[PDB]
Amino acid sequence: GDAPGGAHMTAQTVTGAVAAAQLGATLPHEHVIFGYPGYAGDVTLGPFDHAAALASCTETARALLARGIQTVVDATPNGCGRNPAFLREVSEATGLQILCATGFYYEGGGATTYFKFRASLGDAESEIYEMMRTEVTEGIAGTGIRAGVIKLASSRDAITPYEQLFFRAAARVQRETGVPIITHTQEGQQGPQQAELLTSLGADPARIMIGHMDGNTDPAYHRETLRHGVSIAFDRIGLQGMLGTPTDAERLSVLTTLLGEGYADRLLLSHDSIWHWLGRPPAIPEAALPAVKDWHPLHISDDILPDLRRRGITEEQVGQMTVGNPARLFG
């Protein structure tokens, strides 16, 4: 099949290097803690309770291990609450392996003023590149802990000029270090555009995962993205009807079709769940409860896989999505 080609570093988790064979069943896109841009300004009434967070994240970590999952890829952007040391605490406490990211969110849902300003005054792309390269090769914030992936995100109607600064920096770091790239796509769009842009900039398709692809329910769109040889992730499995997000019945309809067409080696599954919110905990209106009911990280192990198997998906295909694909993409 398609193996990563070029410069390569051993997978870096918040607790250090891990061999590809030691990754095991992996959730490729989750958030241990997360706060939307602006949460830190609500510090007075929404402070971070370290003790409660640690206890709650370590428990979720344990529940995961209980189900055979050994690794989690935390895709939290630098300004959305990323905290490598905390991730390290959870990991040293449970034995759950956690990789964290380096990257900023999409123009629409991130704090883009900082770099939009630096770009108007100077060379923001090379500044973003230096940040990503330092974080992947040396470490984040002096902690000595390195990012195991680069997180990229684009808007719905287009990969904006602000967003492309990050896409060009990452491609450079990716060619230089071979580090994986995972992405966020907004509202089921830009998947083909993201894969085309990244590969044309020289990023290795075997090290790219276009995310939130479950956000589109027309398989023509998934197939068009897959032609680029990149992997795609149905990664918000469990979040249903929440903000135009589809239902799981819709995601499985598309997923089985793709699996039916031989695409298992490029298909990955995650929930994009938040284990502990930063800021004031989410006030979820009764009427929106069914949309977040299955949005936690045990949902794929307990409800999705058994569902794919009973529908004819093979143990081998399930293993390809959950163990094989992650080992090669991140290992």
Give the x-and-dash track for 34-73 against a copy of itself (CB under 8 A).
Answer: -xxxxxxxxxxx-x--------------------------
Which uninterrupted H or E stretch holds 117?
helix 113-121
Q: Which stretch binds a copy of itself (CB under 8 A): 106-114, 152-160, 165-173, 256-264?
A: 106-114
Report whether 194 contacts 185 (CB < 8 A).
yes
Of the residues 3, 21, 51, 121, which one makes contact with a copy of itself according to CB under 8 A: 121
Closest contact distance (angstroms) between CB of 172 and a copy of itself is: 16
How many residues of this chain interact with a copy of itself, rule: CB under 8 A?
46
Interhelix angle for 50-66 vs 84-94, to 10°? 50
Does 127 bind a copy of itself (CB under 8 A)? Our answer is yes
Interhelix angle for 113-121 vs 124-137, to 10°? 120
Q: For residues 117 and 253, which CB has a smaller minimum distance to a copy of itself in the complex? A: 117
Residue 212 among known ligand-binding residues: yes
Closest contact distance (angstroms) between CB of 138 and Co ion is: 25
Report whether 74 contacts 103 (CB < 8 A).
no
Residue 31 among known ligand-binding residues: yes
Of the residues 94, 112, 177, 185, which one makes contact with a copy of itself according to CB under 8 A: 112
Closest contact distance (angstroms) between CB of 104 and a copy of itself is: 6
Give the x-and-dash track for 247-286 against a copy of itself (CB under 8 A).
Answer: --------------------------------xx-xxxx-
Q: For residues 214 and 313, which CB has a smaller minimum distance to Co ion in the complex? A: 214
Q: For residues 280 and 311, which CB has a smaller minimum distance to a copy of itself in the complex? A: 280
Closest contact distance (angstroms) between CB of 148 and Co ion is: 15
Closest contact distance (angstroms) between CB of 153 and a copy of itself is: 12
Burial of residue 201 (CB within 10 Å: 0-12, 13-18, 19+) is: middle
Residue 151 among known ligand-binding residues: yes
Distance between CA atoms of residues 39 and 232, nearest Å: 30
Residue 42 among known ligand-binding residues: no
- Find all residues with CB under 8 Å of 141, minimum gap 6, and list them: 84
Closest contact distance (angstroms) between CB of 238 and a copy of itself is: 18
Cα angle value 175/182/43 (rounded, 5°)? 120
Instruction: Give me the phi and psi of 298, to 5 degrees please.
Output: -105, -10
The dihedral of CA 229, 234, 236, 240: what is its sign? positive
Beta strands at 231-234 and 267-269: parallel, antiparallel or unpaired? parallel
Point out which residues bind Co ion (CB under 5 A). Answer: 75, 184, 272
Residue 276 among known ligand-binding residues: no
- Find all residues with CB under 8 Å of 4, minimum gap 6, and list them: 178, 204, 206, 207, 328
Report whether 256 contacts 221 (CB < 8 A).
no
Tell me which residues touch a copy of itself (CB under 8 A).
35-45, 47, 77-80, 82, 104, 109-115, 117-118, 121-123, 127, 130-131, 134-135, 139-142, 279-280, 282-285, 288
